[PDB]
Design a binder for this molecule. Structure first.
Ligand SMILES: CCCCCCCC/C=C\CCCCCCCC(=O)OC[C@@H](O)CO
Ligand SMILES: CCCCCCCC/C=C\CCCCCCCC(=O)OC[C@@H](O)CO
Ligand SMILES: CCCCCCCC/C=C\CCCCCCCC(=O)OC[C@@H](O)CO
Ligand SMILES: CCCCCCCC/C=C\CCCCCCCC(=O)OC[C@H](O)CO
Ligand SMILES: CCCCCCCC/C=C\CCCCCCCC(=O)OC[C@H](O)CO
Ligand SMILES: CCCCCCCC/C=C\CCCCCCCC(=O)OC[C@H](O)CO
Ligand SMILES: CCCCCCCC/C=C\CCCCCCCC(=O)OC[C@H](O)CO
Ligand SMILES: CCCCCCCC/C=C\CCCCCCCC(=O)OC[C@H](O)CO
Ligand SMILES: CCCCCCCC/C=C\CCCCCCCC(=O)OC[C@H](O)CO
Ligand SMILES: CCCCCCCC/C=C\CCCCCCCC(=O)OC[C@H](O)CO
Ligand SMILES: CCCCCCCC/C=C\CCCCCCCC(=O)OC[C@H](O)CO
Ligand SMILES: CCCCCCCC/C=C\CCCCCCCC(=O)OC[C@H](O)CO
Ligand SMILES: CCCCCCCC/C=C\CCCCCCCC(=O)OC[C@H](O)CO
Ligand SMILES: [Cl-]
Length: 242
């Protein structure tokens, strides 16, 4: 009957501690094409942010191409951002690229006394792969890049010019319902951080028992099982300061 995904994320490790809930909700669903909306919110790094997007995914037997557009709103700091994303996915392999475009201007900072803040423009490229012979095991590679004289990519107490970072992570999905992982990130100025995270994933089209059985993890990681996965993007609005 119903199709799509609800996902809770819990994360900790430093600056971006908190929780989130997101939904992927199809409005047109055929073998060749899916059109969907995605909506969610999060309380992370002492800010409340909500996000609304839509896109399409186009399917071939061996691959999927997709695009999406997002509006990101940090209600705590009143910062607004436009997002655009592309997708190229296959069995056991999900690649995405995302662009992050400021829609609001300088204004008095929410967290930093004596500063103005606004969204930092940037992009990221994201890969998630799963071992085909043991798909419960996944790896994550991200490159991200942001622009401005004083950007807070790692935290807002160490501001940096045009910072970039590479993330490498591993994660484990014993059953489709839950994924746990650890992400290591290294960036400019020799910044490093660690992110521990757990996701609870509910698939609307799956029975309860299917979602707590290890044998359905492989299905989830194939192209056709992954079709309702959330967009891979950063839903947090990275800020710059002046
Ligand atoms: C702020 C300016 C940026 C623009 C924001 C607009 C965001 C919308 C983005 C993507 C929406 C595209 C999805 C809409 C595409 C729907 C296609 C469809 O359902 O066709 C089915 C028929 O073929 C059945 O016969
Ligand atoms: C579905 C799409 C997946 C395909 C991935 C796309 C491949 C992208 C290839 C190369 C991206 C390299 C970006 C280039 C790296 C940018 C570095 C920069 O902007 O300057 C930093 C200085 O200004 C600091 O002061
Ligand atoms: C710390 C534990 C966090 C809670 C774990 C929750 C796991 C799922 C995560 C988000 C789910 C929220 C939305 C859950 C929505 C479920 C709707 C439902 O029950 O299906 C109707 C069908 O039975 C009709 O046939
Ligand atoms: C090979 C695979 C390796 C993976 C194995 C690594 C194990 C780490 C697992 C889970 C960490 C869970 C962290 C949960 C985060 C705590 C909740 C939180 O910090 O946020 C609450 C916040 O107050 C709300 O707004
Ligand atoms: C609509 C806005 C929804 C969520 C904003 C914050 C979402 C946090 C939802 C997580 C629910 C959860 O899993 O709570 C576990 C723990 O208590 C957490 O600290
Ligand atoms: C600036 C222009 C971009 C537009 C941005 C708006 C976001 C959604 C847009 C259009 C929905 C168009 C119609 C498609 C919506 C449902 C499609 C449909 O007709 O479904 C048929 C039915 O499901 C058969 O089983
Ligand atoms: C403006 C933003 C987007 C334009 C929306 C583009 C709508 C393009 C239609 C997609 C489509 O018709 O896909 C058919 C599918 O291949 C058969 O099920
Ligand atoms: C900047 C972009 C703003 C985003 C705005 C984009 C427009 C669509 C977005 C969300 C719709 C929410 C999803 C709609 C849920 C409808 C469910 C439905 O139609 O059920 C029929 C079935 O899903 C058919 O298979
Ligand atoms: C920029 C707009 C001004 C600000 C607006 C703030 C409020 C909008 C929040 C969320 C919209 C998306 C919610 C869509 C939820 C629809 C899900 C649904 O009803 O479809 C499932 C149903 O079971 C199928 O038959
Ligand atoms: C740009 C600002 C956007 C702000 C947006 C307001 C805050 C929305 C926050 C969280 C989710 C919103 C609730 C949407 C719930 C839809 C889920 C749904 O329709 O469920 C389908 C059903 O469960 C099938 O089994
Ligand atoms: C139909 C199949 C669709 C598949 C194809 C979808 C194509 C669009 C996808 C992603 C957009 C990525 C946007 C990346 C923009 C880079 C932003 C940037 O580089 O800003 C730096 C600026 O110059 C400061 O100096
Ligand atoms: C559809 C597939 C799309 C894939 C594309 C994703 C990767 C490229 C993204 C951004 C590159 C932008 C290049 C910007 C790097 C240099 C900007 C710069 O030099 O900064 C301004 C200057 O320093 C002032 O003095
Ligand atoms: C536990 C420490 C790390 C362990 C976890 C590391 C998992 C491996 C990650 C990426 C390699 C696998 C990526 C999969 C690449 C296959 C590309 C593909 O599309 O394969 C088609 C499929 O084999 C037929 O349909
Ligand atoms: Cl990701």
């Amino acid at each position: 009957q119903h199709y799509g995904t609800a996902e809770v994320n819990l994360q900790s490790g430093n600056n971006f501690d908190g929780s989130s809930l997101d939904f992927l909700l199809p409005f047109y669903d055929s073998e060749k094409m899916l059109a969907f909306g995605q909506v969610g919110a999060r309380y992370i790094d002492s800010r409340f942010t909500a996000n609304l997007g839509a896109g399409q995914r186009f399917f071939l037997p061996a691959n999927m191409l997709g695009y999406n557009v997002f509006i990101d709103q940090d209600f705590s700091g009143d910062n607004t951002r436009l997002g655009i994303g592309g997708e190229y996915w296959r069995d056991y392999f999900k690649s995405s690229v995302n662009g992050y475009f400021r829609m609001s201007g300088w204004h008095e900072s929410y967290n930093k006394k004596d500063y103005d803040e606004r969204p930092a423009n940037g992009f990221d490229i994201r890969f998630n792969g799963y071992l085909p012979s043991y798909p419960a095991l996944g790896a994550k590679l991200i490159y991200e890049q942001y622009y401005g004289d004083n950007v807070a990519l790692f935290n807002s107490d160490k501001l940096q010019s045009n910072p970039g970072a590479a993330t490498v992570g591993v994660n484990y999905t014993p059953i489709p319902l839950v994924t746990m992982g650890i992400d290591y990130r290294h960036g400019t100025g020799n910044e490093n951080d660690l992110l521990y995270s757990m996701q609870f994933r509910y698939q609307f089209d799956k029975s309860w028992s299917q979602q707590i059985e290890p044998q359905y993890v492989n299905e989830l990681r194939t192209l056709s099982g992954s079709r309702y996965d959330l967009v891979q993007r950063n839903n947090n609005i990275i800020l710059e300061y002046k």
